[PDB]
From a paper:
UPF0201 family proteins constitute one such uncharacterized, archaeal specific protein family. The UPF0201 family proteins occur as a single globular α/β domain with approximate dimensions of 55×35×35 Å3. The protomeric structure consists of a five-stranded, anti-parallel β-sheet, five α helices, which are located on one face of the β-sheet, and three loops connecting helices and strands. We have further documented that all members of this archaeal specific protein family share a common polypeptide chain fold, which is evolutionarily related to the RRM motif found in the ribosomal L5 proteins and many other RNA-binding proteins.
For 10077b and 10077c from S. solfataricus and S. solfataricus P2, respectively, full-length constructs bearing C-terminal His6 tags yielded crystals and structures. Our four UPF0201 structures represent subfamilies N149845 (10077a, b) and N130963 (10077c, d). The crystallographic asymmetric units contain one protomer in 10077c, two in 10077b and four protomers in both 10077a and 10077d. While 10077a, 10077b and 10077d all form one type of dimer (typeI), 10077c forms altogether different dimer via crystallographic symmetry (typeII). For type II dimer in 10077c, the interface surface area is larger and equal to 982 Å2. At the type II interface the turn connecting -strand β1 and helix α2 interacts with the turn that connects helix α4 and β5 (residues Gly115-Asp117). Majority of the interactions seen at the type II assembly interface are due to exchange of strands β2, β3, and the turn connecting them (residues Gly25-Asp50) between the two monomers. Moreover, this part of the structure in 10077c is about 5 residues longer compared to the other three. The interactions involve a large number of residues, which include Ser9, His13, Glu14, Thr15, Glu16, Asp17, His46, Asn49, Glu55, Asp116 and Gly117 of 10077c. Despite that the type II assembly involves large number of interactions and presumably more stable than the type I, such an assembly is seen only in one among the four structures reported here.
Numbering used by the authors: 4 to 85, 88 to 128, 131 to 144
Amino acid sequence: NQAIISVFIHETEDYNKIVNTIESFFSPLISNSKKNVTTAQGHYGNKIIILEYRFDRKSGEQFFKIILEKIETSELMLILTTSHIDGSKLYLRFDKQYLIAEHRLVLKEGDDVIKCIISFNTSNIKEEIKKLVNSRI
């Protein structure tokens, strides 16, 4: 139905390192997505960067799929085992450190993460990752 990647990058962070990591890790599907970069700031030179990637339906399912084929079973179960749902969209917040330092998807808490939001039009949702979690095992 649709998928979105969203990350807030700070001054102290290596913006390029993150971009390359993300565009590579999700390569080459992410090459077909709409990329957005925006910069916000306060009144005292405090800049935040908002990096986004939109996936249309065509690449939506394929984006979820690639996340499923990359995430370790441990973290996957940790998902099913779960509060990451609002409406029909699933919010998966990944650890920035782990992805750029070890190309590894490790769930993390909060908004200071690489956020992946998937939108379903079926709700039900569980059974599929379960069959996969179950399958992998």
